């Protein structure tokens, strides 16, 4: 909870693949400060420079019915405090009632310009499938898993907003991780291996373009990995 | 009084919004997507408890008795089963300034009784 | 820059630079071990093998009373008896079974969740398991460790015997330590009487440059910090060759 | 304490226990069962435009504790609501004899319910039942320190420190507070030099600034010759305006480009000097 | 006893037997009471330690001399290290409602909250050690942080007042020649020679003021004892001298009123250039003045000398009315002090 | 809100009388120190009804040095004073051939009115004051030292003694509350007399800007 900000409470999640895609796609699910009918819940998704209400995200994931959305966010319908705290975001995002419309909304808010709604929608769909909460899964048909996790994130934001839970301490070392030589060299090796495959791609491209074979022994610039690790550690 | 719960439509499972029958002057809950309507039964559409009269005994759960880090005492036995041992803890919940009140839970299995002194 | 309470046993409270990097540059404690990382696939298979229900198989109505189960932060499913589930996972870790010792298992009770972690970088330290109000480290263990050069009985065998357990900072929240075996005895007024772990030795909270300080518990902490900073500047024999 | 209550800002939310919106079609038979006693006492005769009535009903419940602590009355609350919302919002309320203080509000004639909820959210905070705005809380105490005691000269000519009640407010509303009954407008002061300069004047802010500096230095028991503080205050108040000790106060005076560049904004100062063809007299 | 009292306070708080004090939250009140008890206990133990200290104790020797250390130091070495505070508060619950895993949740006892009951010589238990380390960390951070801000402040002050200086006409002007102060420090005096002194005609009541400052020239016996026969006869007979003395007292009374208005509070302490008391003491020693013998210094001479000296002392030079008003204002306080101290009755 | 309205009106009249007396206008002692009861007896205690009406509080005082140099004090009834009201006051001042007036507004004043006060400045020097700022006499505050408007001859003597220009003295904004209280304009010098803990009394001089 930032004292000086437009948001009262912010539930973030630096998401990363179990053992790949080192860049940690940070996703935020914030609540607008009381200062308007109620308190609105939004989500600063990656590759999008504009906040989006959670309800659009849930509908873009294939859960259009508001009952299904609440079933994913609030697990106990016997909590009228929870319904009253989630009501403003629902009332603020109801004109959208289909997955395609929600995806188009996301694609319209995406950093990339929506030259065509089709590309725009596809842009979003792949963002919600790859960038949003990658640790939960980047494959297809996992929208249920992503919906449940985002619902739990909203549940955590509501528990913090209603005070039934304590805010998380940024200094608690149980909430920290130590990147040792292993993960550090792994991050460098990944980026440098990518650069190596890049140089090999360009080499083989400019050779096959002449209609002839190419030698990987000559394409593989071993100096990339060698001098890279050497420079970083030096 | 009590809070007011959300009513969901039976066709599209969307939320029903309050509306009035201008001709009959009666409260209805109508769906903003389809043309469904329901006759209200509470007549109240909004309740905000500013004083926050919350009974924390409802937030407490019997499972807290299994926490080894909580203090135990033998001076307050359980009234529902008579068990002597019982864990006690503070509210520690935000929006409750007078949190020094102690809440007890019975450590007996299958009892899970909760109370306050 | 402040010395957070969670640095107990994981980082040296004294060893830190006094310049413009106070509190930022830290030093591991003597018995502190940073986890290396492990695959969660075996844990996931064990959880599925037990009564856990996957997240897509359940109905939202079942999530209310059930206990959520996370693995490396991924919500995998829910469970009904988290008490015996945690008891089982702990027995497996204490038996060096499917769950390896570096795996963290924190059961939040108030929120009804079981966070399991196999991630790397989780700073943790060893602790003596205490079952009733008695230590699992019996005298036969000390005997075997005394004849460590003959019977090849090492720390690994001590951990595999379920006498010691690697506890991380996040699990220390759910752990009730006993500073010394004296705290496990019956006193005129029982303080805890429900300890679950014990400290091997409190001096292990100190780091390397702070461990050389004699009677550091008789000095003002700034002094111990300045010594932790000067022991590295002291002359000697930095290496034999 | 009366003065403290009259000065400390109070909103409706402070004294409001809860609020609820009901679809009450006919007030004659209120949905609630406890208001029925007085609703009839009020609707037995047509006092307002019954025709222009809305079934939507805003019922607010107050709390005795706060109500008494602030000596506020339902009549006062009703008058404030009527003043702020005009006649469009009809307001009735029970006397201060029921165990629970409840007032009912209707709209005369966005949807009616939506507007009612909006105005409810607005009134809970905006409406100022009493007190001066910007003053969140007021503290009343007896100054143990003589410096804060009212020193008076006795008939025999002896200094006597009368320990009288003093109020310390968390906000700064000097303008309004000084113009208040039973509030001494001579001694009462503010720590906000900006406010002092705005209300009293350049000389008054000079004095207040000197006091503030002296207090800051002396808090730890340090002593500095008064002349130093006086000189600093004169430097900050020699142009008739509060010249902050920053680039925004030092580089804005006709001190010559070289000195300003020596302080901050070197390139900008020289650039502007070049553009305006300024001449440095080489006095600094 | 201190820990027992803290336990009783905690018990009342848990039993809802503690009401919040006015202007304070219930939790704040609890913390205030607990801290009060702990502080009082620390103070009592420390005082006991100092009283136990012998004259030969080296800690006592250094502290008494002021060379190094303080009673607090002695109380943390010999009695109780005290309560450790982070951010001006008892050790926070870094864990879930626990400062350390060794304690239990919702534990507000002195030990759990970081009350080091052991002295340095006794040795600190591991938890006490950790909490003390926390407090030390706080101090180290403050020391390593304040520096930057203080340096920036000093730089800004310098850049904003580097050119202000005292001109040959005795006025304080900046580089632009804009008059900042007519006289430096409003008195045109250096900051080194000035020294602390006390005004003898500010606090005294009217009765004491008159009994101590109005020269009594009607008491022949008193005049005989204080002054020599020739002075006594001259004072008694001559009426011009008596009138001058009365005028001098009236001037002192007016100065007293001026001092009252200048100082609403009764604080006689003031910084003035010359320590008149010390100078008079020096004069007594140098001239071997014997206090038990009648003085030969005529009071009329005293009055004339004070007025002449006052005229000689000139911060602002000029016979025009503006200059002479500025001079009068500049030396007003010092002149009042001069007349009060050099009062003929006091000098007699 | 009627006893409080009459109380405010009395305080404002008292402050205005003190202001005119400090500016040097002839104000009798009885009206300078008029109790609330005397004010109610001379004007009334029902301003809401219209007794006294704010128009009846209008003050007209004359300078001690020049009897024909009068000064007005108007108390408009409308909360926000408009250009038409400024024109009405300008008409009355033109009729009575008076050059100084004070407009005691309640809420504030319109931009057109401010523009009229600045464009008509050289002909009629009319000032504005808020009743909120007239309910207290700031000059009685302990932080405010004794200000004294100097005469052009005394300013000439000051500059000739200290041998300095007008732009060398410290400045005081024309919008300063004390400058407004004493009604001083650009170019005038105000002498401030303040107590000093090091010298006893210190006199400084500020030029208005
Ligand atoms: Zn529907
Ligand atoms: Zn029970």
UniProtKB/Swiss-Prot annotation, chain B:
UniProt entry keywords in alphabetical sequence: Acetylation, DNA-directed RNA polymerase, Metal-binding, Nucleus, Transcription, Zinc, Zinc-finger
Record carries keyword Lyase: no
Family matches, as PROSITE patterns: RNA_POL_M_15KD (PS01030), ZF_TFIIS_1 (PS00466), ZF_TFIIS_2 (PS51133)
Superkingdom field: Eukaryota
GO biological process: maintenance of transcriptional fidelity during transcription elongation by RNA polymerase II; transcription by RNA polymerase II; transcription initiation at RNA polymerase II promoter; transcription-coupled nucleotide-excision repair
Zinc finger (TFIIS-type): 74-116
SUPFAM superfamilies, A to Z: Zinc beta-ribbon
Family: Belongs to the archaeal RpoM/eukaryotic RPA12/RPB9/RPC11 RNA polymerase family.
Protein name: DNA-directed RNA polymerase II subunit RPB9
Organism: Sus scrofa
Lineage: Eukaryota, Metazoa, Chordata, Craniata, Vertebrata
Gene, per the UniProt record: POLR2I
């Amino acid at each position: 909870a930032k004292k000086d900000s437009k948001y009262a409470y912010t539930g973030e999640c630096r998401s990363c693949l179990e053992n790949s895609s080192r860049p940690t796609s940070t996703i935020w699910v914030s609540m607008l400060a009381r200062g308007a009918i109620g308190q609105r819940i939004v989500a600063t998704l990656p590759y999008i420079k504009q906040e989006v209400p959670i309800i659009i995200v849930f509908r873009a994931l294939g859960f259009v019915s508001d009952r299904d959305i609440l079933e994913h966010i609030i697990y106990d319908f016997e909590d009228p405090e929870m319904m009253e705290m989630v009501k403003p975001s629902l009332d603020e995002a109801f004109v959208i009632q289909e997955q395609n419309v929600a995806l188009n909304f996301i694609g319209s808010r995406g950093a990339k310009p929506g030259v065509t709604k089709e590309k725009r929608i596809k842009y979003a769909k792949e963002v919600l499938q790859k960038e949003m909460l990658p640790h939960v899964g980047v494959s297809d048909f996992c929208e249920t898993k992503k919906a449940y996790f985002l619902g739990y994130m909203v549940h955590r934001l509501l528990l913090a907003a209603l005070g039934r839970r304590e805010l998380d301490d940024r200094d608690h070392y149980g909430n920290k991780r130590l990147d040792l030589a292993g993960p550090l060299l792994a991050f460098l090796f990944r980026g440098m291996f990518k650069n190596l495959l890049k140089e090999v791609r360009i080499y083989a491209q400019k050779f096959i373009d002449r209609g002839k074979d190419f030698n990987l022994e000559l394409a593989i610039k071993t100096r990339i990995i060698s001098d890279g690790l050497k420079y970083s550690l030096a | 009084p009590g809070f007011v719960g959300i009513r969901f439509c039976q066709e599209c499972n969307n939320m029903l919004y309050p509306k009035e029958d201008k001709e009959n002057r009666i409260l209805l809950y109508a769906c903003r997507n389809c043309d469904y309507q329901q006759e209200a039964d509470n007549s109240c559409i909004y309740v905000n408890k500013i004083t926050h009269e919350v009974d924390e005994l409802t937030q407490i759960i019997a499972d807290v008795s299994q926490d080894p880090t909580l203090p135990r005492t033998e001076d307050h036995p359980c009234q529902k089963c008579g068990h002597k041992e019982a864990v006690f803890f503070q509210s520690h919940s935000a929006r409750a300034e007078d949190a020094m009140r102690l809440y007890y839970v019975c450590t007996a299995p299958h009892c899970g009784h909760r109370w306050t002194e | 820059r402040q010395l957070h309470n969670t640095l107990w046993g994981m980082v040296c409270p004294a060893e830190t630079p006094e310049g413009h990097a106070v509190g930022l540059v830290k030093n591991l404690a003597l018995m502190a071990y940073i986890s290396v990382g492990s695959q969660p696939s075996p844990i996931l298979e064990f959880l599925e093998e037990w009564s856990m229900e996957n997240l897509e198989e359940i109905s939202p109505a079942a999530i209310a009373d059930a206990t959520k189960i996370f693995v490396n932060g991924c919500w995998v499913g829910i469970h009904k008896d988290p008490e015996q589930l945690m008891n089982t996972l702990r027995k497996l870790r204490r038996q060096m079974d499917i769950i390896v010792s570096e795996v963290s298992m924190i059961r939040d009770i108030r929120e009804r969740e079981i966070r399991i972690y196999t991630d790397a970088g989780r700073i943790c330290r060893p602790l003596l398991i205490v079952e009733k109000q008695k230590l699992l480290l019996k005298k036969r263990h000390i005997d075997q460790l005394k004849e460590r050069e003959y019977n090849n009985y090492s720390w690994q065998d001590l951990v595999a015997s379920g006498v010691v357990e690697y506890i991380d900072t996040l699990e220390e929240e759910t752990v009730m330590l006993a500073m010394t075996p004296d705290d496990l005895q019956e006193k005129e007024v029982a303080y805890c009487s429900t300890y679950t772990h014990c400290e091997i030795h409190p001096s292990m909270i100190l780091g390397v440059c702070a461990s050389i300080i004699p009677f550091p518990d008789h000095n003002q902490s700034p002094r111990n910090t300045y010594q932790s900073a000067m022991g590295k500047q002291a002359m000697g024999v930095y290496i034999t060759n | 304490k009366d003065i403290l209550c009259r000065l400390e800002h109070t909103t409706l939310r402070k004294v409001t226990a809860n609020t609820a919106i009901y679809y009450d079609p006919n007030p004659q038979s209120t949905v609630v069962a406890e208001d029925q006693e007085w609703v009839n006492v009020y609707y037995e005769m047509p006092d307002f435009d019954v025709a222009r009535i809305s079934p939507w009903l805003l019922r607010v419940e107050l709390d005795r504790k706060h109500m008494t602590d602030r000596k506020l009355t339902m009549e006062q609350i009703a008058e404030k609501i009527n003043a702020g919302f005009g006649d469009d919002l009809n307001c009735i309320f029970n006397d201060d004899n029921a165990e629970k203080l409840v007032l009912r509000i209707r709209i005369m004639n966005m949807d009616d319910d939506v507007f009612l909820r909006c105005i409810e959210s607005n009134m809970l905070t905006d409406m100022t039942l009493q007190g001066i705005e910007q003053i969140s809380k007021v503290y009343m105490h007896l100054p143990q320190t003589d410096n804060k005691k009212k020193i008076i000269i006795t008939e025999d000519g002896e200094f006597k420190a009368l320990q009288e009640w003093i109020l310390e407010t968390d906000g700064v509303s000097l303008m309004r507070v000084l113009s208040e009954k039973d509030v001494d407008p001579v001694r009462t002061t503010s720590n906000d030099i900006v406010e002092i300069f705005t209300v009293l004047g350049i000389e008054a802010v000079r004095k207040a600034l000197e006091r503030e500096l002296y207090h800051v230095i002396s808090f730890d028991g340090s002593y500095v010759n008064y002349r130093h503080l006086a000189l600093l205050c004169d430097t900050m108040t020699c142009r008739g305006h509060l010249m902050a000790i920053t680039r925004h106060g030092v580089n804005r005076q006709d001190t010559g480009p070289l000195m300003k560049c020596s302080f901050e904004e070197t390139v900008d100062v020289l650039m502007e000097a070049a553009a305006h063809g300024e001449s440095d007299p080489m006095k600094g | 006893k201190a820990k027992q009292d803290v336990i009783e306070v905690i018990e009342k708080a848990h039993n809802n037997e503690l009401e919040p004090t006015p202007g304070n939250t219930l939790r704040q009140t609890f913390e205030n009471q607990v801290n009060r008890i702990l502080n009082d206990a620390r103070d009592k133990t420390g005082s006991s330690a100092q009283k136990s200290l012998s004259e030969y104790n080296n800690f006592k020797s250094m502290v008494v001399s002021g060379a190094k250390g303080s009673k607090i130091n002695i109380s943390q070495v010999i009695a109780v290290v005290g309560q450790q505070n982070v951010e001006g508060k008892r050790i926070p619950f870094g864990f879930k409602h626990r400062t350390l895993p060794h304690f239990i949740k919702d534990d507000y006892g002195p030990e759990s909250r970081g009350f080091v009951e052991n002295s340095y010589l006794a040795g600190l238990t591991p938890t006490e050690f950790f909490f003390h380390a926390m407090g030390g960390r706080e101090g180290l951070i403050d020391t390593a942080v304040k520096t930057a801000e203080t340096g920036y402040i000093q730089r800004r002050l310098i850049k904003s007042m580097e050119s202000v200086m005292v001109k040959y006409d005795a006025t304080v002007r900046n580089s632009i020649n804009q008059v900042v102060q007519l006289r430096y420090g409003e008195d045109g005096l250096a900051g080194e020679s000035v020294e602390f002194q006390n005004l003898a005609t500010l606090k005294p009541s009217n009765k004491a003021f008159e009994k101590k400052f109005r020269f009594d020239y009607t008491n022949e016996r008193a005049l005989r004892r204080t002054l020599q026969e020739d002075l006594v006869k001259d004072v008694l007979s001559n009426a011009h001298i008596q009138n001058e003395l009365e005028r001098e007292f009236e001037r002192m009374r007016e100065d007293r009123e001026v001092l009252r208005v200048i100082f609403p509070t009764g604080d006689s302490k003031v910084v003035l250039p010359c320590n008149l008391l010390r100078m008079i003491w020096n004069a007594q020693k140098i001239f071997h003045i014997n206090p038990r013998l009648p003085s030969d210094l005529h009071p009329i001479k005293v009055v004339e000398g004070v007025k002449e000296l006052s005229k000689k002392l000139v911060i602002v030079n000029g016979d025009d009315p503006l200059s002479r008003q500025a001079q009068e204002n500049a030396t007003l306080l010092f002149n009042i002090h001069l007349r009060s101290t050099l009062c003929s009755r006091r000098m007699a | 809100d009627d006893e409080e309205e009459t109380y405010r009106l009395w305080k404002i009249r008292k402050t205005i009388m003190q202001l005119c007396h400090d500016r040097g206008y002839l104000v009798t002692q009885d009206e300078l120190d008029q109790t609330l009861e005397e004010f109610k007896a001379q004007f009334g205690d029902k301003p809401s009804e219209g007794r006294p009406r704010r128009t009846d509080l209008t003050v007209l005082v004359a300078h001690n040095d020049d009897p024909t140099d009068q000064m007005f004090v108007f108390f408009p009834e409308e909360p926000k004073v408009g250009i038409k009201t400024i024109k009405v006051y300008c008409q009355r001042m033109q009729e009575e051939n008076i050059t100084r007036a004070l407009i005691v507004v309640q809420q504030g004043m319109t931009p057109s009115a401010k523009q009229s006060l600045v464009d008509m400045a050289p002909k009629y020097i009319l000032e504005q004051f808020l009743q909120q700022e007239l309910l207290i006499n700031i000059t009685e505050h302990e932080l405010v030292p004794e200000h004294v408007v100097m005469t052009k001859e005394e300013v000439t003597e000051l500059l000739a003694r200290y041998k300095l220009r007008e732009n060398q003295l410290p400045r005081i904004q024309a919008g300063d509350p004390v400058a407004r209280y004493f009604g001083i304009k650009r170019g005038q010098v105000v002498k401030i007399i303040r107590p000093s803990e090091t010298a006893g009394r210190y006199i400084t001089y500020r030029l208005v800007q």
